[PDB]
Design an enzyme around this catalytic site. Structure first.
Site, PDB file in Angstrom:
ATOM      1  N   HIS A 147       0.404  -0.226  -0.464  1.00  0.00           N
ATOM      2  CA  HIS A 147      -0.176  -0.183  -1.795  1.00  0.00           C
ATOM      3  C   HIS A 147      -1.323  -1.182  -1.917  1.00  0.00           C
ATOM      4  O   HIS A 147      -1.585  -1.987  -1.020  1.00  0.00           O
ATOM      5  CB  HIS A 147       0.889  -0.466  -2.856  1.00  0.00           C
ATOM      6  CG  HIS A 147       1.839   0.669  -3.079  1.00  0.00           C
ATOM      7  ND1 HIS A 147       2.812   0.644  -4.055  1.00  0.00           N
ATOM      8  CD2 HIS A 147       1.962   1.865  -2.456  1.00  0.00           C
ATOM      9  CE1 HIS A 147       3.495   1.774  -4.021  1.00  0.00           C
ATOM     10  NE2 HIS A 147       2.999   2.532  -3.060  1.00  0.00           N
ATOM     11  N   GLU A 200      -1.495  -3.624  -4.299  1.00  0.00           N
ATOM     12  CA  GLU A 200      -0.922  -4.944  -4.540  1.00  0.00           C
ATOM     13  C   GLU A 200      -0.379  -5.556  -3.256  1.00  0.00           C
ATOM     14  O   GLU A 200      -0.579  -6.749  -2.995  1.00  0.00           O
ATOM     15  CB  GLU A 200       0.183  -4.856  -5.595  1.00  0.00           C
ATOM     16  CG  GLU A 200      -0.243  -4.235  -6.919  1.00  0.00           C
ATOM     17  CD  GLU A 200      -0.191  -2.718  -6.903  1.00  0.00           C
ATOM     18  OE1 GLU A 200       0.178  -2.143  -5.857  1.00  0.00           O
ATOM     19  OE2 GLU A 200      -0.515  -2.099  -7.939  1.00  0.00           O
ATOM     20  N   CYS A 244       6.270  -3.764  -6.294  1.00  0.00           N
ATOM     21  CA  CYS A 244       5.144  -4.667  -6.506  1.00  0.00           C
ATOM     22  C   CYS A 244       5.561  -5.888  -7.316  1.00  0.00           C
ATOM     23  O   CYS A 244       5.119  -7.008  -7.034  1.00  0.00           O
ATOM     24  CB  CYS A 244       4.002  -3.926  -7.200  1.00  0.00           C
ATOM     25  SG  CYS A 244       3.401  -2.474  -6.306  1.00  0.00           S
TER      26      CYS A 244
END
Ligand SMILES: [Mg+2]
Ligand SMILES: [Mg+2]
Ligand SMILES: [Mg+2]
Ligand SMILES: [Zn+2]
Ligand SMILES: [Zn+2]
Lengths: 1332, 145, 156
Positions: free
Chosen positions: B53, B55, B86
């Site tokens: 991802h 993040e 996250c």
RNA sequence: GUUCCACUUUCUUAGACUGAGUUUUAGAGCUAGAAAUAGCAAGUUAAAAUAAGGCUAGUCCGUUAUCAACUUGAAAAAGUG
DNA sequence: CTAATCGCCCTCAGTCTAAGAAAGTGGAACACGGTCGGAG
DNA sequence: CTCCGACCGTGTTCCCTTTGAGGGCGATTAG
């Protein structure tokens, strides 16, 4: 729903009620009375205040003094009754004139001259005998027949002041010579030991032995002048004996038995008899000589005159004092005439100056007079000898002085007997009554008999063998001394708690030692190769070990166990013992003592004599008067021999055990038929403990015991200060009323805190120093004279306690350099919060202590040990400090538990189906450190002087913190909640850990860890921040325990609540009628007669009586020549002395006082501290009948309180400099708070205090000092608060300006105010509009 | 300049670049002391990694640059409310504050669907900022999907 | 062979490898159809990455070997109980089941502290198997921490 | 926390005592001056009381503890918002 | 002829005997439900 | 294979840590 917080102190009990969300409920309470208001809203928080409770000491002292006075009077009465018949023939009214000597001539029945009745004979008497001692000496030495009145005067003077009774036996004072006696002792000693003679050596024994040093020091000096002679030797022991010490003679004569002799002890003759029988009586005269020498020196300080010249050395010494006083007075007068006649009027005429006139006629002491004439003397010349007399304290001495308490009664008895022998040749009745008079002076009621009561004395216990009146001559025959001593001891000894009706056995009882030895043996285990587990000892084995080892060796060591038992019978080369260290703790000491005395083992082993033996030991314990021990043992003198009884007399025991005879060997299990001792002797496979026996559900002992096992009595029976008991009663009552307020629902938790009670000595300090220095032999007192009030300075006190020396470095200190020196904590303050001298030390630099994080290092110990030894022997350091230094070289509280138990027993009174307590209410006890740290951490600052709100605030915070603690960690309930406990954590300490070197550090870490959940962010000591969630919950249940976003706001709202129920306990004053001072005659209606017929205008008397309580009187009094009936309403103070009379008939009392038509139904009793409200809300409390106190509390906003706290404390609050700087900038930003606070104080004072002058002086003084630093100004503003404080007005200093207290010298306004009757909590009020 | 809108528009530009790369338009920028230390975009499909991802990439780049798993006093801006993974990674990274844009009641674990950073069982608390350019992010997501 | 105990024993072997590297001893293996697809151990400290957990490593290896971020029907075995981060990653991976051994009820993300795997708003339900070799797992953890009374309390 | 044994330091309770201190009275003050006014000489001791007092009549007791207001109640105790 | 203020003032020192509790040091408790080792 | 019998540890926070006073009283002041 709700919990109660309580803060229990010695003068205050704070209370608060909180809910589940830390809110304090506000309720509307009905207001009773005839007033306007019908109700008032009140917050459920407050604090009860009360004066301290006092001990019973002063009452005891007063009572004993009374008894002394009455007994002395009875002595005089006995004397007069003896002399009555023979006096009636010589002088008809002599005793009458004697008894009326106090009356003024106008009041006298007979003529004013007591002794002879006319001027000429009286002047002649006083001319021939200026003092009584002249008559004493003349009557002792002369042979002429004397007037019976003079004889009586002498005898009465000797009998009225007989002297002390601290030396037993009789004295032989004919031998007055110290040098000849010492030389004779040395002579006979050198004769008896031809091998080694002592050299007289020119040792000035008189000076060394009579010097003003301690016994030990004088001994040391004496034997320092003798070469090769030790203090433990024969001659050393003899010197110790003559000095009044207790030496032991066993090592000199190879005697196994202790031979300790004390000349003062009444048993001296018998102990010496036994010693001489053991060693041979050819040494008796030797000890006789020692005694004769002790006699010649006993009174050397007082007599100062050779006993050859006269048989009355005391009276002769007094006549000496008189003559020297006379001569030196003539000389002094001549000198002052010649050289300073201008000051003659000041010296010999002014009574107020402390001169000779103030000395003789005024109230000036010998010390004050000496200090007065010291300069006059030294400024003159020709007085070289007067100074010598002054340093000897022998300049102008009187005969009746403070230091005459040394005189023993034996010398007054000697003079009495001499006079009696002299005058018995002429008066037959003196011969026939000589013994009676001597027994009058000699006799003294034994302390173990007590008051000679007849069933009407709460304190007395003595029993009467017959119903005669008790006199000194028939005392032994009428009073049963034995049963009286028995009661004396049995009325105080503890009863067995397990069997409250049974007396505790003597500590040295044979049964008690059998019980203890068996109780220890029972838990001894052993294992061999064959057996599979270690086994207990059986009955047979135990009887074997006792009969073979315990009954043959006085003490049994572990080595003797191993070698003589384990090796010989079990072939064990090595074994480990766990409960005792190097020797069996228990021992059969009495068995071997007796075996040594009676010499008949079979007599001791016979079970039928056990009770008899126990009774003998009981007698040996119960009495210590050898003549009575002998009388008690006289019955058994026939069983073995006279010698065994003689030896049994000397054997004495002290102390009492813990358990009763019925507990150890009386109860029998119904099924077994065996007593506890039977199970200890033999219990088969399980060798059950006494604790197990007492707690074994299978056996019936516990239930059979549980049969036998008032609030005020229960509280009064506790041990502690009466002040805290007062507080306990008050807090119990508060709790009761709080429960009543809350609809009789019981609280969920009660959190209690108690203030430090250890804090709640100049004479003791001066004594300590005086003794330590005299023993040490230091001159520092002569070089630097000190006074008790100087020792209040800590550094000076320390300096003197160490003889002006460094404690770590073996060097001298300077009395002028204390500011440079350091006071170091022996055990660092971080571990032990000890502020006393026991843990504090003065050194020139703390670096010489060694390491900083610990006790002084081994080097310092090595270097200073001997010095510490010297300080110990001189009593300059205590035993605790020494023992801590030694082990350092070799490597809540009971009262609160009692409170918690009382509360728990009052609150939980129901039992479940299993007969177990249902703990509806949890009592939690917290220490002060938790709330203190919470306040410091979260800035809930406390300033005591602002008002009394902090007492309540502390209770609130206690409740909050307690409930939070138990909510978050319920497993810690065992530690924080009373009752159910957890038997564990003992095995956890047998494993290695991170840091377990000290329990103090463990507790520190523990409490610093548990309380972290209150904070939002933590700063470890690594520059590391640690974050915590906003909502604090308990993992297992998920219930919210804390909310950082709202709970603090609630706390701040609670702390800021303006109205708090502070109620001062109204109390009737009790105790002494008035001041004890006896004032001279004066024309004033304040003087109270000391006796019924003693008009105070002629004789004086007492003054300033204390009002027990005021009383409202409404009546009429005459006014003017025509006696108009005016109407009056006023407060009349009923004094403590008048109280009973006022209660017996108030109407008659008021009518006698001058009141008429007294409205009886309007009489209001007004005890001290009665509360009255006046318009604008101004209130006053009744301080007296003619003075009032302030009745208001200044509610200062919390912002100003915190600002003041932070501004007053600058050199504190260590840690990161950033927060300190932010607080500095906060101060500078909010400096206007000072002006706002003084404005508030001014408004308050103008509305309530009403003292315009004091307020103007405050305003002025503050105006002049605005330029000065904020810290100083803040501290002095804190000082300013005593102007507005509750209670009695008091003086105070503001910026060196002293403000005298403004008193309220009138009570008129109170007479029209509104009386407020307050409950203990102040929630219920009855207001009475005093309009009538 | 240097405000929340500036970093939000920078992450939106990163998301537009990732969309040009035929990936999910999600970006993340980790800045500490006004210095950009990490930049990332959601490229889970382009790398065959479910944990790839924006993040996570930004936190890994920050940890690699700082040579330390702890990211004290860091601020992470993102155009999308962080998910549970996250949020856990932000907790373990000990970051100072997270500033997200459009809310997500279905996947955003920063208050919309649940609370992770300020949970009572956590040993660390992280600050949350919302409401910066939510409409533009929602429009971009609707245009992409 | 290929039983639950066999795979848990392999995961314990990987956790012991992590213990050799002086890392928290946690291992994970991702299996599909009785075939080895991915293995991992915790390497956070030695590789300076707070997300380098056993589960993350195993999931990334499975994704790489299968060339697909979706791991439908796969089973992930892990000795310890996964944290919130790892549980979220398992949800994102769409795996079929997670098998863990000893619980840990002070940070557990499968019911103790919270329920995330079986959360009602998730678009996929992951099955949970608990207690495989719980005794060996907890003994390994206790021997690593060297702090007693925790494992016994958790088991009881 | 409870509890069994040993060592030390402090405190509490009760008893027997001692020496002082204070108040009136007895210690024939003298010499000029009616008086104020002034000079000179002695000065150390003794008696009685030492909480006023009480009846139970003892060689006893009298300064500790307890006590908002009302109502029902000899004391105790209970109720009243 | 009333009351309100300002200073000044306030019984004390020691000895012995006995019992108990209450702090600091030390030595020892205040239990049971399965659970694994053998048997005829 | 159920029946008989001697035995033993787990329990506080803890799952990478933080280390002298105050009321009485005479003399003065004040209307
Ligand atoms: Mg009397
Ligand atoms: Mg006198
Ligand atoms: Mg009282
Ligand atoms: Zn995500
Ligand atoms: Zn994880």
């Amino acid at each position: 729903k709700y919990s109660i917080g309580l803060a229990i102190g010695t003068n205050s009990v704070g209370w608060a009620v909180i809910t589940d969300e830390y809110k304090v409920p506000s309720k509307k309470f009905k207001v009773l009375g005839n007033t306007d208001r019908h109700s008032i809203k009140k917050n459920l928080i407050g604090a009860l205040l009360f004066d301290s409770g006092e001990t019973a000491e002063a009452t005891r002292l007063k009572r004993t003094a009374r008894r002394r006075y009455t007994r002395r009077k009875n002595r005089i009465c006995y004397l007069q009754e003896i002399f009555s018949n023979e006096m009636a023939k010589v002088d008809d009214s002599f005793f009458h004139r004697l008894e009326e000597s106090f009356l003024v001539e106008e009041d006298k029945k007979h003529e004013r001259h007591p002794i002879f009745g006319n001027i000429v004979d009286e002047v002649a008497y006083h001319e021939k005998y200026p003092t009584i001692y002249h008559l004493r000496k003349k009557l002792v030495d002369s042979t002429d027949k004397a007037d019976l009145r003079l004889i009586y005067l002498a005898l009465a003077h000797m009998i009225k002041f007989r002297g002390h009774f601290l030396i037993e036996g009789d004295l032989n004072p004919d031998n007055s010579d110290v040098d000849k006696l010492f030389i004779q002792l040395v002579q006979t000693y050198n004769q008896l030991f031809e091998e080694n003679p002592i050299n007289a050596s020119g040792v000035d024994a008189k000076a060394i032995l009579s010097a003003r040093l301690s016994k030990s020091r004088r001994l040391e000096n004496l034997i320092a002048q003798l070469p090769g002679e030790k203090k433990n030797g024969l001659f050393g022991n003899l010197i110790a004996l003559s000095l009044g010490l207790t030496p032991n003679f066993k090592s000199n004569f190879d005697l196994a038995e202790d031979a300790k002799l004390q000349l003062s002890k009444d048993t001296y003759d018998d102990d010496l008899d036994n010693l001489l029988a053991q060693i041979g009586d050819q040494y008796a005269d030797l000890f006789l000589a020692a005694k004769n020498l002790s006699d010649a020196i006993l009174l050397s300080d007082i007599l100062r005159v050779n006993t050859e010249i006269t048989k009355a050395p005391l009276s002769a010494s007094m006549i000496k004092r008189y003559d020297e006083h006379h001569q030196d007075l003539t000389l002094l007068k001549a000198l002052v005439r010649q050289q300073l006649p201008e000051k003659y009027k000041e010296i010999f005429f002014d009574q107020s100056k402390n001169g000779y006139a103030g000395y003789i006629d005024g109230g000036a002491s010998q010390e004050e007079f000496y200090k007065f004439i010291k300069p006059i003397l030294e400024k003159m010349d020709g007085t070289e000898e007067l100074l010598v007399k002054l340093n000897r304290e022998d300049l102008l001495r009187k005969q009746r002085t403070f230091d005459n308490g040394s005189i023993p009664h034996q010398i007054h008895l000697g003079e009495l007997h001499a006079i009696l022998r002299r005058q018995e040749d002429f008066y037959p009745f003196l011969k026939d009554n000589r013994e009676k008079i001597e027994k009058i002076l000699t006799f003294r009621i034994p302390y173990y008999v007590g008051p000679l009561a007849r069933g009407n004395s709460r304190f007395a216990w003595m029993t009467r063998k017959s119903e005669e009146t008790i006199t000194p001559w028939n005392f032994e025959e009428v009073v049963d001394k034995g049963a009286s001593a028995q009661s004396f001891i049995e009325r105080m000894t503890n009863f067995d708690k397990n069997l409250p009706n049974e007396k505790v056995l003597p500590k040295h009882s044979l049964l008690y030692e059998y019980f203890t030895v068996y109780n220890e043996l029972t838990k001894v285990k052993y294992v061999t190769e064959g057996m599979r587990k270690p086994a207990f000892l059986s009955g047979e084995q135990k009887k074997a070990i006792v009969d073979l080892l315990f009954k043959t060796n006085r003490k049994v060591t572990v080595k003797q166990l191993k070698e003589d038992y384990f090796k010989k019978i079990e072939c064990f080369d090595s074994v480990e013992i766990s409960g005792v260290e190097d020797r069996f703790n228990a021992s059969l000491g009495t068995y071997h003592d007796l075996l040594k005395i009676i010499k008949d083992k079979d007599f001791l082993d016979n079970e039928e004599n056990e009770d008899i033996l126990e009774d003998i030991v009981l007698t040996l314990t119960l009495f210590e008067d050898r003549e009575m021990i002998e009388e008690r043992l006289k019955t058994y003198a026939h069983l073995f021999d006279d010698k065994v009884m003689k030896q049994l007399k000397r054997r004495r025991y002290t102390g009492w055990g813990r358990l009763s005879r019925k507990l150890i060997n009386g109860i029998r299990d119904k099924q077994s038929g065996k007593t506890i001792l039977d199970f200890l002797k033999s219990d088969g496979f399980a060798n059950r403990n006494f604790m197990q026996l007492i707690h074994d559900d299978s056996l019936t002992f516990k239930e059979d015991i549980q049969k036998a096992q008032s609030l005020h009595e229960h509280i009064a029976n506790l041990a502690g200060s009466p002040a805290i008991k007062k507080g306990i009663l008050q807090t119990v009552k508060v709790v009761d009323e709080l429960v009543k307020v809350m609809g009789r629902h019981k609280p969920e938790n009660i959190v209690i805190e108690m203030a430090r009670e250890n804090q709640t000595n100049s004479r003791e300090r001066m004594k300590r120093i005086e003794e330590g220095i005299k023993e040490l032999g230091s001159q520092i007192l002569k070089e630097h004279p000190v006074e008790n009030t100087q020792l209040q300075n800590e550094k000076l006190y320390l300096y003197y306690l160490q003889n002006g020396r460094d404690m770590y470095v073996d060097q001298e200190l300077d009395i002028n350099r204390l500011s440079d020196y350091d006071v170091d904590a022996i055990v660092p303050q971080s571990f032990l919060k000890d502020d006393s001298i026991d843990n504090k030390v003065l050194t020139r630099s703390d670096k010489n202590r060694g390491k900083s994080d610990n006790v002084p290092s081994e080097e310092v110990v090595k270097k200073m040990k001997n010095y510490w030894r010297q300080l110990l022997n001189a009593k300059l350091i205590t035993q605790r400090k020494f023992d801590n230094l030694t082990k350092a070289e070799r490597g809540t509280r009971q009262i609160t538990k009692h409170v918690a138990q009382i509360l728990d027993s009052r609150m939980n009174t129901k039992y479940d189906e299993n007969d177990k307590l249902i703990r509806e209410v949890k009592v939690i006890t917290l220490k002060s450190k938790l709330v203190s740290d919470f306040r410091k951490d979260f800035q809930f600052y406390k300033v005591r002087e602002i008002n009394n709100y902090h007492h309540a605030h502390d209770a609130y915070l206690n409740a909050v913190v307690g409930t939070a603690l138990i909510k978050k960690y319920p497993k810690l309930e065992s530690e924080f909640v009373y009752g159910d406990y957890k038997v564990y954590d003992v095995r956890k300490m047998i494993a290695k850990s991170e840091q377990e070197i000290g329990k103090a550090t463990a507790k520190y870490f523990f409490y610093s860890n548990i309380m972290n959940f209150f904070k939002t962010e933590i700063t470890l000591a690594n520059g590391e921040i640690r974050k915590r969630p906003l909502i604090e919950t308990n993992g297992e249940t998920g219930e919210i325990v804390w909310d950082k976003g709202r709970d603090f706001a609630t706390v701040r709202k609670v702390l800021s609540m303006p109205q708090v129920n502070i109620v001062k306990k109204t109390e009737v004053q009790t105790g002494g009628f008035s001041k004890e001072s006896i004032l001279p005659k004066r024309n004033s209606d304040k003087l109270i007669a000391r006796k019924k017929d003693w008009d105070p205008k002629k004789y004086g008397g007492f003054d300033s009586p204390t009002v027990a309580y005021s009383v409202l009187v409404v009546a009429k009094v005459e006014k003017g020549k025509s006696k108009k009936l005016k109407s009056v309403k006023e407060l009349l103070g009923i004094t403590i002395m008048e109280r009973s009379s006022f209660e017996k008939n108030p109407i008659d009392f008021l009518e006698a006082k001058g009141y008429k038509e007294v409205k009886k139904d309007l009489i209001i009793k007004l005890p001290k501290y009665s509360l009255f409200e006046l318009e604008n809300g101004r209130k006053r409390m009744l301080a007296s009948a003619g003075e009032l106190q302030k009745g208001n509390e200044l509610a200062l906003p919390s912002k100003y309180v915190n600002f003041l706290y932070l501004a007053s404390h600058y050199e504190k609050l260590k840690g990161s400099p950033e927060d300190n700087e932010q607080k500095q900038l906060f101060v500078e930003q909010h400096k206007h708070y000072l002006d706002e606070i003084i404005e508030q104080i001014s408004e308050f004072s103008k509305r309530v205090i009403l003292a315009d002058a004091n307020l103007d002086k405050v305003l002025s003084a503050y105006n002049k000092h605005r330029d000065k630093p904020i810290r100083e100004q803040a501290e002095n503003i804190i000082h300013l608060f005593t102007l507005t404080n509750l209670g009695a007005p008091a003086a105070f200093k503001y910026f060196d300006t002293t403000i005298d207290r403004k008193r309220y010298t009138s009570t008129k306004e109170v007479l029209d105010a509104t009386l407020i009757h307050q409950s203990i909590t102040g929630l219920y009020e009855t207001r009475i509009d005093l309009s009538q | 300049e240097f405000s929340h809108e500036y970093w939000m528009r920078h992450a939106l530009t990163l998301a537009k670049r990732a969309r040009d790369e035929r990936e999910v338009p999600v970006g993340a920028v980790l800045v500490l002391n006004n210095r950009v230390i990490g930049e990332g975009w959601n490229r889970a499909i382009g790398l065959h990694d479910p944990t790839a991802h924006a993040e996570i990439m930004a936190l890994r780049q920050g940890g690699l640059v700082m040579q330390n798993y702890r990211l004290i006093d860091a601020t992470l801006y993102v155009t999308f409310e962080p998910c549970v993974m996250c949020a856990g990674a932000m907790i373990h990274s000990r970051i100072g504050r997270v500033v997200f844009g459009v809310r997500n009641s279905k996947r955003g674990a920063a208050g919309s669907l649940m609370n992770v950073l300020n949970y009572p069982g956590m040993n660390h608390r992280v600050e949350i900022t919302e409401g910066i350019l939510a409409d533009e992010c929602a429009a971009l997501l609707c245009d992409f999907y």
